[PDB]
Scaffold this active site. Structure first.
Site, PDB file in Angstrom:
ATOM      1  N   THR B  44       0.827  -1.218   0.000  1.00 56.85           N
ATOM      2  CA  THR B  44       0.000   0.000   0.000  1.00 56.85           C
ATOM      3  C   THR B  44       0.861   1.268   0.000  1.00 56.85           C
ATOM      4  OG1 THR B  44      -1.558  -1.220   1.417  1.00 56.85           O
ATOM      5  CG2 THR B  44      -1.969   1.107   1.080  1.00 56.85           C
ATOM      6  N   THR B  45       1.856   1.262   0.868  1.00 54.86           N
ATOM      7  CA  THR B  45       2.723   2.435   1.039  1.00 54.86           C
ATOM      8  C   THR B  45       3.588   2.650  -0.192  1.00 54.86           C
ATOM      9  OG1 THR B  45       2.728   2.182   3.450  1.00 54.86           O
ATOM     10  CG2 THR B  45       4.477   3.476   2.515  1.00 54.86           C
ATOM     11  N   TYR B 107     -13.024  -3.444  -2.392  1.00 53.00           N
ATOM     12  CA  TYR B 107     -14.098  -3.006  -3.266  1.00 53.00           C
ATOM     13  C   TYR B 107     -15.196  -4.028  -3.517  1.00 53.00           C
ATOM     14  CZ  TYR B 107     -16.668  -0.671  -6.842  1.00 53.00           C
ATOM     15  OH  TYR B 107     -17.678  -0.083  -7.549  1.00 53.00           O
ATOM     16  N   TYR B 133      -3.489  -9.829   4.987  1.00 54.91           N
ATOM     17  CA  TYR B 133      -3.436  -8.422   5.366  1.00 54.91           C
ATOM     18  C   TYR B 133      -4.836  -7.825   5.413  1.00 54.91           C
ATOM     19  CZ  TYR B 133      -2.295  -3.427   4.384  1.00 54.91           C
ATOM     20  OH  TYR B 133      -2.191  -2.061   4.308  1.00 54.91           O
ATOM     21  N   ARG B 138      -9.945   0.593   4.424  1.00 50.92           N
ATOM     22  CA  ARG B 138      -9.594   0.796   3.010  1.00 50.92           C
ATOM     23  C   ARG B 138     -10.317  -0.156   2.065  1.00 50.92           C
ATOM     24  NH1 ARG B 138      -4.820   3.414   1.485  1.00 50.92           N
ATOM     25  NH2 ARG B 138      -3.355   4.012   3.163  1.00 50.92           N
ATOM     26  N   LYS B 161      -1.059  -9.430   8.660  1.00 54.69           N
ATOM     27  CA  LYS B 161      -0.817  -8.029   9.026  1.00 54.69           C
ATOM     28  C   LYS B 161      -2.170  -7.482   9.455  1.00 54.69           C
ATOM     29  CE  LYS B 161       0.504  -3.560   7.114  1.00 54.69           C
ATOM     30  NZ  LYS B 161       0.595  -2.848   5.817  1.00 54.69           N
ATOM     31  N   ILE B 203       4.724  -4.090  10.422  1.00 57.34           N
ATOM     32  CA  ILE B 203       4.924  -3.819   8.996  1.00 57.34           C
ATOM     33  C   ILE B 203       4.567  -2.348   8.940  1.00 57.34           C
ATOM     34  CG2 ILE B 203       4.166  -4.269   6.624  1.00 57.34           C
ATOM     35  CD1 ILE B 203       4.932  -6.687   9.383  1.00 57.34           C
TER      36      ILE B 203
HETATM   37  O1  LIG Z   1       2.321  -0.400   2.905  1.00 56.46           O
HETATM   38  C1  LIG Z   1       1.672  -1.245   3.392  1.00 56.46           C
HETATM   39  O2  LIG Z   1       0.908  -0.908   4.300  1.00 56.46           O
HETATM   40  C2  LIG Z   1       1.793  -2.643   2.856  1.00 56.46           C
HETATM   41  O3  LIG Z   1       2.631  -3.225   2.204  1.00 56.46           O
HETATM   42  O4  LIG Z   1       0.729  -3.196   2.985  1.00 56.46           O
HETATM   43  O1  LIG Z   2     -24.065  -1.890 -10.242  1.00 51.18           O
HETATM   44  C1  LIG Z   2     -23.596  -0.801  -9.985  1.00 51.18           C
HETATM   45  O2  LIG Z   2     -23.797  -0.646  -8.704  1.00 51.18           O
HETATM   46  C2  LIG Z   2     -22.615  -0.167 -10.894  1.00 51.18           C
HETATM   47  O3  LIG Z   2     -23.039   0.124 -11.966  1.00 51.18           O
HETATM   48  O4  LIG Z   2     -21.540   0.316 -10.571  1.00 51.18           O
END
Ligand SMILES: O=C([O-])C(=O)[O-]
Ligand SMILES: O=C([O-])C(=O)[O-]
Lengths: 291, 291
Positions: B44-45, B107, B133, B138, B161, B203
């Site tokens: 991430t970093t 996500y 992790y 996030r 982590k 970490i």
């Molecule tokens: O940067 C961080 O936090 C990593 O590698 O996950």
């Molecule tokens: O389905 C939804 O939520 C999209 O279109 O991003």
């Protein structure tokens, strides 16, 4: 300018995970026949995350082909890299998409100014109508109303999908914008209310399985018929809840399989709807007259 | 088996965003000289999200080359697609990485079973030590202690982590594992505390700018010296806070620039640290004797 019921279409898959092209074609035709006003291809509900760049192009291309200009097609082209979002959005433009839908960068948590610069760079790089998409619960970031209002001043930024389901906040955004760009609901549970308050439509999960009903809810809500909107939405209100018993699109894909429209394919890390939710989902579909 | 201060190293960039190869080399050498115990490359970093596939490989290859086996190198290989995670992890194995660090899919919000299957598929596909992790703020998903404990049974899953910064929960995880896999702090603010409670290391973001001090904090905390751990951590405690005034790695990259170690490059949607935060940052660095 795109208004009404805009389905965030699933990407039908064979059991092994391959895209089910024949089922996809039939779903698009069915949406058109049933009254869906527009399709978002390869959005969150279409498993953008697990499709390759080539598969993303292919799905957008196929939906546009089958649609044959009858309804506008919006391509999901969001990425958490500005460079990547540009590439994806350019590809969508070249494929003949009518607009692109771009979720805020997820995971990396940009600042509000970073969100502004991200969308501004994309708008300046690609001549295509762009629709912002805010869904803080999934992304780790919240594009504020204030930042949204700033971005509506940018040429090619034509709307925002507001998935907060926060109706007072959505109304405040609509009122602040005063028509400068469109607001779409991204929350099926409250979409009818947001449309009654001036949203241009609903980029809907529920429309996947009740396209005719959702097309009607949007028509009456856009027409500002408060009572018809309440009545029609009431008939499918249970669906708006049950389609999120596990993370979307897990339940909606299972619903479509129970309707006989697609196979069970879904890509890890997503999983077929857990066995225990299947009977309850069948019951909700039966209750609403879908099966 | 990896213990101590594990720097989540930044990816230095030129003003135009290109990777700054010379500055990366210098940092890797400085960490080794200063007592850093391990490096996480392209986590991430390190702006994993905005680096290309090729650049991810090059950065890992460069860090391994410069380290010349003096300390273990852990490759960030997480993705929100199980297929993509497998590909990245295989590449890391092939490049000679000692382990891989895999953030939970972000996500797309997999179910707990989906998270389990995701990591199981990766562990079975790639014979390389894997570190889970979890950073729910996030990713939009929280890998539960229960799921972590299940995954600890899978042979090449060797640690996690824990970036929750929730010490009671981290302790419970340590206690439940009873040594089956390692726990690493992913929260600098509480890392000293978690290590005193049995975590194998930190970490660390702060280690980017205070590698000697963090190396010493980890060492005494792992040795269960509560008084020395508190004493040493106090000297750098304000850093753990200030390095998050905007989303990591925004502040840490600016800090390194103030230290004269890297240039200002950072890739959209991330932005250089906002001007309002720069003086307080310079002051904290002056206060800690860093500059
Ligand atoms: O940067 C961080 O936090 C990593 O590698 O996950
Ligand atoms: O389905 C939804 O939520 C999209 O279109 O991003």
């Amino acid at each position: 300018t795109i208004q009404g019921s805009i389905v965030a279409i699933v990407t039908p898959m064979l059991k092994d995970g391959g895209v089910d092209w024949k089922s996809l074609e039939k779903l698009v035709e069915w949406h058109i026949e049933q009254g869906t006003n527009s399709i978002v291809a390869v959005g969150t509900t279409g498993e953008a995350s697990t499709l390759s760049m080539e598969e993303h192009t292919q799905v957008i291309k196929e939906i546009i082909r089958v649609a044959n200009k009858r309804i506008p097609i919006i391509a999901g082209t969001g990425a958490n890299s500005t460079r990547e979002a540009i590439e994806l959005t350019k590809a969508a433009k070249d494929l003949g998409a009518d607009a692109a839908l771009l979720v805020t960068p997820y995971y990396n948590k940009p600042t509000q100014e970073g969100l502004y610069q991200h969308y501004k760079a994309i708008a300046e790089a690609v001549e295509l109508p762009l629709i912002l998409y805010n869904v803080p619960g999934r992304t780790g970031v919240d594009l504020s109303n204030d930042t949204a209002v700033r971005l509506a001043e940018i040429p090619n930024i034509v709307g925002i999908k507001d998935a907060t389901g926060d109706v007072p906040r959505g109304k405040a955004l609509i009122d602040a914008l005063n028509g400068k760009m469109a607001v779409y609901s991204g929350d099926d549970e409250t979409a009818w209310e947001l449309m009654l308050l001036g949203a241009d439509g609903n980029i809907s999960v529920t429309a996947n399985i009740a396209p005719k009903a959702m097309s009607e809810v949007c028509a009456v809500a856009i027409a500002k018929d408060e009572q018809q909107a309440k009545t029609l939405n009431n008939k499918i209100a249970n669906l708006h809840n049950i389609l999120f018993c596990e993370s979307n699109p897990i339940p909606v894909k299972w619903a479509l399989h129970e309707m006989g429209l697609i196979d069970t394919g879904i890509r890890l890390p997503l999983t077929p709807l857990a066995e225990q939710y299947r009977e309850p989902l069948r019951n909700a579909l039966k209750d609403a007259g879908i099966i």
